[PDB]
Amino acid sequence: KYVDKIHIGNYEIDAWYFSPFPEDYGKQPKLWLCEYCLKYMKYEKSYRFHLGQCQWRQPPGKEIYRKSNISVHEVDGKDHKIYCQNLCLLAKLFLDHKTLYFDVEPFVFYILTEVDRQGAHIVGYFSKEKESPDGNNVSCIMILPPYQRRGYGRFLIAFSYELSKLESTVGSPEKPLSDLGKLSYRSYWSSVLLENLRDLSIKDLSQMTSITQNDIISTLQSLNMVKYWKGQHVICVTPKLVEEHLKSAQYKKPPITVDSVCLKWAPP
Template sequence: MSHDGEGLYGILNERNIKEVQFGVDKRFPTWYGSNVYFDPESRALGYLEKNGSDGLSGSNGTNGHNKGDVQFWLDTLYVCEYCFKYTDNEEDLAGHAKHCRFQKHSPGKIKYKSPNYTIKRVKGTKHRLFCQCLCLFTKLFLDNKSMYFKVDHYEFYIVYETSSTKPMGFFSKDTVSYYQNNLACVLVFPPYQRRQLGTFLLDFSYKISKSEGLISGPEFPLSPFGLIGYVKYWSLKICWEFSEGELANMEKITLENISSVTGFRISDIITALKYLGCLGESDEIYLSILRKKLNRHSCEALVEDEYLLLDD
């Protein structure tokens, strides 16, 4: 996601933070480099230059690392798994976690609540520091479309296990979108991947759009991984509609029919049908092929309408 040209600011060609300690029991390597955590001259964590206004108290930003190393500026970044505040000191993180106000009550308003998962909407205008720290964290795992400071025009939809207050992933949505995009960026945090939560969040973004009567889709351009995720999701949803949904008994289908039912943009539907090998010349849809494509067990990650709480 980007705003005022800020989107790619801070991205480096190589990783500069070696690992993240996320809470007390989750440690994993970063995927991308970002200098936005640091003062550009001293390479100390930036909040240390601001008297602790953006993070926790900490030391000198090196936590034992050799400053002469040409790649890593920091061995370990310690990040609160409830509020995303950060430090370079393990003891400071442990002390903060005991008193973090979001440990018992996560921010935002519930928009979906099932026995398994809860999604909460957090407005950038209301929880600015939380959203800024979330965006800083995101920059370590997305290589594009990740702003971090100007969050006032964004909403963040954060997924939790219903029994927990630990965020597992999120997507952001621009509240002022000329193209009526329903998603700016999406990330499932490393410890929670391979649970189909990405598909779950994409589906929820379309539920929001449909509740608003919009035909919508993500902000472009998509990253390579983002495009793969979307093509698989669009294909899954279209196949399901033809197999068990509103299009199951229709003999003649147009792209407009599919768009009306799914809420997908026609250009995205074409991309998915080409991926499925079900689109011929003159946009002819091969229904017999399409109806055989669905794996009936693959829809388990989709949002269940009965648990939606979208009315404001």
Template sequence: MGNKTVAAEDENLYGILKEPNIGKVQLGLEKMFPTRYGNAAYFAAGTQSLGIRDSVDTPRRTTTSGVGATDFWLDTLYVCEFCFKYTDEEVALRRHVSCCRYRTKPPGRIQYMSPEYTIRKVRGSKHPLFCQCLCLFTKLFLDNKSMYFKTDHYDFFIIYQSSTKEPMGFFSKDLISYQKNNLACVLTLPPYQRKGIGSLLVDFSYKLSIRDGLISGPERPLSPFGLVSYLKYWSSQICWQLLEGDLSGSGRTSLDAISRATGIRIGDILLTLRSLNCLTKDYDVSLSVLRAWAKDNYSYRNSLVRDEYLVLDN
């Protein structure tokens, strides 16, 4: 009984809902897409409202009824694509976007700058409002992440189009991680999915942990989709090292050597090798199986992040 009470309190605290309660999101002035999961926190901010308007108003619950009715509390949520503040009025969004402070100068410090992408580190303790609004938005598209107001102990790495300064995705990193995780949550914004943004962010998270001398990985549990994405990334890194990288031609290689070369935890390496079905009866790695995987995944490579564009700080 006590556990059920705690679970119910957590759902109320974090706004967890089993079904979507917002029909669609308009991100900026042009991008519109449906939500995937429910988020009651938008409607319960009260005097702590993070919305676009200066008053304490929050989006109004406007469930429809009658012919063609839905169970949505709100048909459309309008979100600024530069600061992730929100409103239930399109005119308010348009008024805000024209003067949003982050439209021309995004928050945080540049960590990576290529002709295509820029990654900026935003400290949750320094930019709490931006990070809280980002986390609220994320809850509409990820079902296994509930934090949105305790951002002080997180860094957020936002990837932007270098030419337009439009955010395309992000990952967060817990600064107080006893497991030394290099990633807590990752999201590619719906308009930019299937463009390799998520894999690039994951690769960047490993660049950070390798710079710090850590063998690391993502926070558990992984969602089913997250596990599939990571297995593809881990497979590419392991295949590269064994077929073309520092470990190629070295004969029998230990899990520890693969871990040191890739920065991937041994448990994740073993999981990946089993998923590739490349372990022999003697627990050797079948290079012929890896070559076949590499041929089928011809776009794999050692790193998506190019070292010459890194501008890392501490």
């Protein structure tokens, strides 16, 4: 019998997948998580006692982005091992394909929080390999269900790519992606590429966005904006065609924007 329901902050959330909490915790109906230190608990009384005790009001690590009440914390798995492990256990409840929960030293985690007078409330996160040979700038990315489809996922995708721009490289999320991950990346890629076109080779779209050329070509193939010529993909769009596309349905929700000004980060 596995964990199938978590209480965290002021939310109760049904699980989607098995997560390898210890047998003693899983066997419980509900698991109770501190929203700041991510400690998980078997009972509400221990939860209520921890609440009055916990002095954390935000994730550990360094705050490398803060505009208004949107915030990102950088947390090294080697320096916050227990915390990053609880994060992976929490993330595996809503990620089918994530497999690595306890070996967190090779990763850095980017915690997205929304802030009020009470503290910095966790919305989602993405992980990233310190050294990614396959050139993947995201390892696992997860928005908690009550926050999904509201702009945070798109914020995190954009944020992973800002880091890729500061490292002078391109990157791509590790695969496979969840159903909603597939759709979120295609929507982001469409938006950014389309926005840049109406404002260009395939290679220069790549260097302006840090989106790989494979990701660009596949997105333009879905938009049907690429000609093939003697083994070469070639962009083929009229500026009016770009606008017919960009005023469509899905591109009318005002995003949470990543403001590079407010991004206090530097590359290793």
